[PDB]
Amino acid sequence: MKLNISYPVNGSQKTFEIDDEHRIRVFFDKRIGQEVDGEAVGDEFKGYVFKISGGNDK
RNA sequence: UAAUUCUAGAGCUAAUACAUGCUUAAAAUCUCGACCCUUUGGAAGAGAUGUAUUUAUUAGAUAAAAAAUCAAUGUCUUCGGAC
């Protein structure tokens, strides 16, 4: 599953690709318009606050 | 996404698009009525009046002559009020 991630202060954006299962399910059962924490998924994402704003299925 | 004039997230800037919003003659006429001190009174001041919407109520005259009359008045006053 891809991850279209964007930073709207610098204006840059970057995609990301992750493969396992257990890091994903923090996202699960969430409507869009709320936040998560990247420490649940990423050691490179310590302290990071997100928000979910769209997707596309298979 | 195998795919069709399929489309998602993030970042910019316009209008005869979208949303708001000022300017201006003088006159007249109505209602309210500070006061006034009086007869038969007259008055400051105030506000109202574009067009469009809806309802109610008036004008939108007309076939041929002259008095008596109830008063009011325009007027020469003829202080009669006839006209």
**Can you give the resolution of this entry in Å?**
3.7
Nucleotides of strand B under 7 angstroms from a protein beta carbon? 1, 8-11
CA distance A37 to A40: 6
Q: Which nucleotide is nearest to A11 (CA to C1')?
A: B11
Please give the method by which this entry was determined.
cryo-EM
Give pairs for A37-40: CB < 8 Å, separation 24+.
none
Q: Which nucleotide is nearest to A53 (CA to C1')?
A: B9
Please tell me what DSSP assigns to residue A49. B
CA distance A56 to A49: 22
For chain A, state the CA radius of gyration: 12
Please tell me what DSSP assigns to residue A2. E
CA distance A10 to A4: 16
